[PDB]
Amino acid sequence: LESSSQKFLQGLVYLIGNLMGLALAVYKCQSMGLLPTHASDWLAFIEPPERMEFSGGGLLL
Amino acid sequence: GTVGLLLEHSFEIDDSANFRKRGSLLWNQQDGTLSLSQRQLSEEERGRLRDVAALNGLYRVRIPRRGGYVSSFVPACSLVESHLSDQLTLHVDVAGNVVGVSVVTHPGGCRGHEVEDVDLELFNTSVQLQPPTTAPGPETAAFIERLEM
Amino acid sequence: MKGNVTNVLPMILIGGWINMTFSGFVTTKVPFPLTLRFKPMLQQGIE
Amino acid sequence: GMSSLYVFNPIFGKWSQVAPPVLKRPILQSLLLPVMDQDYAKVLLLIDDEYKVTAFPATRNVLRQLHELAPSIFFYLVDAEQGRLCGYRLRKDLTTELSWELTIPPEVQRIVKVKGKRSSEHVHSQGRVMGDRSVLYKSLNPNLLAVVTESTDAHHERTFIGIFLIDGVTGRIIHSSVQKKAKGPVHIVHSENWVVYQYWNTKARRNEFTVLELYEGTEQYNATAFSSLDRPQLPQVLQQSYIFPSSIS
Amino acid sequence: LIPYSPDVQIHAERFINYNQTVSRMRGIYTAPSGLESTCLVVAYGLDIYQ
Ligand SMILES: *[C@@H]1O[C@H](CO)[C@@H](O[C@@H]2O[C@H](CO)[C@@H](O[C@@H]3O[C@H](CO)[C@@H](O)[C@H](O)[C@@H]3O)[C@H](O)[C@H]2NC(C)=O)[C@H](O)[C@H]1NC(C)=O
Ligand SMILES: *[C@@H]1O[C@H](CO)[C@@H](O[C@@H]2O[C@H](CO)[C@@H](O[C@@H]3O[C@H](CO)[C@@H](O)[C@H](O)[C@@H]3O)[C@H](O)[C@H]2NC(C)=O)[C@H](O)[C@H]1NC(C)=O
Ligand SMILES: *[C@@H]1O[C@H](CO)[C@@H](O[C@@H]2O[C@H](CO)[C@@H](O[C@@H]3O[C@H](CO)[C@@H](O)[C@H](O)[C@@H]3O)[C@H](O)[C@H]2NC(C)=O)[C@H](O)[C@H]1NC(C)=O
Incomplete structure (x- = not known):
């Protein structure tokens, strides 16, 4: 994707999208109970x- | 109708055969109020108590009933490690009968750091009454109405 | 219908028949610690 | 009033060549010591009328272990005609000392049955789930005795049925429950933490079924070593009633 | 949970004793087996049944 300086920044937005998708997947995972x-x-x-310190007795008396 | 009860405490090295008067407890059957009034401990008694605590002894309490003799044992090591905090509870029947008493300490620990002479001056006690409780029966009247409705 | 790489229907059918034949059974335990929300997944026939 | 003790084999039938003499007054009570010594055998000790402990498997290591434990074993004795629930404990080598004492008036109430906790019982789950996801801890007591008392006088209306929950270690009643119209044969069964006792009602001709359960709070205690000297808390007690059309022999 | 209702009926299906009966039920002893879910129940009294 390296063709200019400005698109090198848009690649970061492309990564951020997948990051927020992973965050959404984790949120659903936790809400479900995984x-x-x-x-x-x-x-x-x-x-x-x-x-510890066991006891015992009865009613024979 | 106000009756006094005799409360004795025990203090020895490892056995227990000596009992002394600690104070007077007033109990009124018709109202249900329980009051305590005990004298303060001397320096020698405080020192004996401190020596007994390091010897992990036993604190027996005697409460004669008008006869019967009720005794209750409580570890004094936690009493000395923590602040003086005893809780007394009388057990009664549906009529004027006495079952027994239990002494309970809120801290109930075994860390045992240290006791300061300022700590063991006043006695902190609370007396409570536990009358028998009536258990419930079958709640069929509500079930019949629920079935009808 | 909408045939899309049909390999899930046969395996599902085989697993369903195997589970139908074996009602109450204990095959093996998994060493991996599993949560209690997957218990309806795993036993499915044991009370 | 003689007491004798026999040592036989449950597999073949022939008795062994080991048998201890018995003297003084008849043997009062006995318990089985979980600790094992000698080869692989457990220790059995008995109480006489003179308030002394007698050990069956006389062994140097047995006595050494018993002296090592020393303040670790307690003894509760229950009397019906006397109506006295008094307790003792071992001190140092072999001697009886009174620790906790309880008296009940025989004219008002009378002891019937006393059940405890089985020695061979292991608990898998120590808690229960609740509404949302929050956990609820139970109250398991290995040292706790339930006593059942009945009214001496028998009347159509005046009937007294109750149960006392006491700790054999330290004299302390946890819960004391009382009925008002219950009489007849009473059956009590003790379990992990729930008590099942049945009775009969004179007012309406029926058998009521009361189930009692002990429950703790949401937060747990030490949960590493259990002891009745500590743990200054009162567990919640739950009661419910049902109808069973039978006699429950 | 099931709604609370003070009525317990004795179902004939939950009858361990199908034909063999005990005239006098003095007591019963339950012994834990070794597998997981098996308990040996012996009822003593006028007769013996296991
Ligand atoms: C003498 O006895 C009285 C009453 O027994 C003591 O008052 C009690 O003091 C404790 C702590 O000192 C209080 O505990 C508190 O409990 C609340 C919840 O109830 C908790 O949020 C606090 O963090 C604290 O643990 C207790 O409420 C209070 N009252 C009672 C027990 O009725 C008094 O402190 C004693 N004096 C000495 C010098 O020990
Ligand atoms: C929960 O209960 C357990 C068992 O009673 C406690 O663990 C025990 O704590 C005591 C007191 O701290 C330890 O005694 C130690 O002995 C050594 C000498 O052996 C002494 O130098 C120390 O000063 C201390 O007195 C004991 O070893 C320890 N036992 C184990 C198995 O760890 C525990 O502290 C309790 N926890 C709470 C929160 O109450
Ligand atoms: C309760 O016990 C009675 C016996 O006192 C049962 O009646 C008998 O039941 C047996 C089987 O349990 C029957 O035996 C059968 O015999 C035929 C040949 O006649 C054979 O082909 C079968 O395989 C079986 O062995 C027996 O005939 C029968 N007797 C009578 C007079 O009916 C009774 O069935 C038991 N109750 C039950 C099982 O609910």
């Missing part, structure tokens, strides 16, 4: 903590 970014999805991963 990217987790949420507490429930991290709770899908949390491992149960250890139990």
